[PDB]
């Protein structure tokens, strides 16, 4: 088999700038005037599209901002200038030897300005407590640098068991990221404490963004 390793795994490039994605092959793939390497673009929830074939042939319809090159064991994809809708995971595929092999793919993050998350916190619904469960939900929406930190504090005591976090794919419209963090525990556990606090730290603030409610207050 021909292992196809793609570095880096993610790359962040600003609108206008150049992105370059590498595809290194464990053995040579160049069958004479043709190196059989394909590039594919996949937007999340979308099916991949053919970008470039036989190393450097632009497939019909794709913008000239996408180009391909390379020989032997080293291959390369370039996009330049990068524009909004290039947010995607790009793949390289070998096809000179069976089995046809793919690279693990490289995500292209669009680089925009810093933006701080909008944080919101949500008590367990009556309807969940009724079933004997309690989840507290916190939303960190529309932020940039993907990098963040969430602290979940209970009565001013950091807690971490029962916390489930998810990240959305970069936003097509505004290129921001978003995350949810959900603390789960049983109803009885929920009922032994007063203050539930979601704290967010982001490189755009030294002051954490702190959002809380009291189970006892109103």
């Amino acid at each position: 088999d021909i292992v196809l390793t793609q570095s880096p795994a993610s790359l962040a490039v600003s609108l206008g700038q150049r992105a370059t994605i590498s595809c290194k092959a464990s053995q040579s793939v160049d069958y004479d005037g043709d190196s059989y390497v394909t590039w594919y673009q996949q937007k999340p929830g979308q099916p991949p599209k053919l970008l470039i074939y036989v190393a450097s042939n632009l497939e019909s319809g794709i913008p000239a901002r996408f180009s391909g090159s390379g020989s032997g064991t080293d291959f390369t994809l370039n996009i330049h200038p990068v524009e909004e809708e290039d947010a995607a995971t790009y793949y390289c595929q070998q096809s000179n030897e069976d089995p046809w092999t793919f690279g693990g793919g490289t995500k292209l993050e669009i680089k925009r300005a810093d933006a701080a998350p909008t944080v919101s916190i949500f008590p367990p619904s009556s309807e969940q407590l009724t079933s004997g469960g309690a989840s507290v939900v916190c939303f960190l929406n529309n932020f940039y640098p993907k990098d963040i930190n969430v602290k979940w504090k209970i009565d001013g005591s950091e807690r971490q068991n029962g916390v489930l976090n998810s990240w959305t794919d970069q936003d097509s419209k505004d290129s921001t990221y978003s995350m949810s963090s959900t603390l789960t525990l049983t109803k009885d556990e929920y009922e032994r404490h007063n203050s539930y606090t979601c704290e967010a730290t982001h490189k755009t603030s030294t002051s954490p963004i702190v959002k809380s409610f009291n189970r006892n207050e109103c």
């Binding site: 043709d34 059989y36 394909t38 594919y40 099916p47 991949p48 599209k49 053919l50 470039i52 074939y53 036989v54 042939n57 497939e59 019909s60 995971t89 793949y91 595929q93 096809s95 069976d98 089995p99 046809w100 092999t101 793919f102 693990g104 793919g105 909008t118 919101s120 916190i121 949500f122 008590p123 367990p124 619904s125 309807e127 969940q128 079933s131 989840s135 939900v137 939303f139 929406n141 489930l164 976090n165 998810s166 990240w167 959305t168 794919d169 419209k173 978003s178 995350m179 949810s180 959900t182 409610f213 207050e217 109103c218």
Partner: protein, 221 residues
């Protein structure tokens, strides 16, 4: 225009079996090489199997050789993947793929939408859909955020809508995370504050494997 639409996927047990289908249109199907390629939960792609225009030649990856069978009917413009002795590792989204003619175009010219395969002992389970509303001492700015918590379902996927589409531009639906053996995800929406009291906001939640569908109006506290 070339179009490939695949089907027949869903949950199946270990050792189990299931046949996938891919329906083709917009091109002379009998001329083309055809393949199945699968994408794992962790986004790696792998060609499981391929077949030529006349069924004279078939290829299988070594991990599926002897368990899978690829076929085609040129009259019906359909391709098939017969799977058996299913392993957990087979769990993926399966695309069917067209090859261009004669090393002309790219070695995979066109892909379908994928159909999902889940091999697992765990059982099909619908979700609980809890409403996420702010406490009565809520965040009174120009906009307010609301949500639904879709918890304890299996397998993927779920779909979440808000007022049946009308609120699309302020919705974030977060990818699911797996716990004991159950997926939980969430979904937020933002709406002008001056709207939430007096106006309905409703998350529409469907889970196709269980034919579930529930709509939860978000009610203040």
């Amino acid at each position: 225009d070339v179009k490939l639409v695949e089907s027949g996927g869903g949950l199946v047990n270990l050792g189990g079996s299931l046949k996938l289908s891919c329906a083709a249109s917009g091109f002379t199907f009998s001329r083309y090489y055809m393949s199945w390629v699968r994408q794992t939960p962790e986004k790696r792609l792998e060609l499981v199997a391929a077949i030529n225009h006349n069924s004279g030649r078939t290829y299988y990856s070594d991990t599926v050789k002897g368990r899978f069978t690829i076929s085609r009917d040129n009259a019906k413009n359909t391709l098939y993947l017969q799977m058996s002795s299913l392993k957990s590792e087979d769990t993926a989204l399966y695309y069917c793929t067209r090859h261009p003619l004669i090393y002309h175009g790219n070695y995979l010219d066109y892909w379908g939408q994928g159909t999902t395969l889940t091999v697992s002992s765990a059982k099909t389970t619908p979700p609980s859909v809890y409403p996420l509303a702010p406490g009565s001492a809520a965040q009174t700015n120009s906009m307010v955020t609301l949500g639904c918590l879709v918890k304890g379902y299996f397998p993927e996927p779920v779909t979440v809508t808000w007022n049946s589409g009308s609120l699309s531009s302020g919705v974030h639906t977060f990818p699911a995370v797996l716990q004991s053996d159950l997926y939980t995800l969430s979904s937020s929406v933002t709406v002008p504050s001056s709207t939430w009291p007096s106006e309905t906001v409703t998350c529409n939640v469907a889970h196709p494997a269980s034919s579930t569908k529930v709509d939860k109006k978000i009610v203040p506290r």
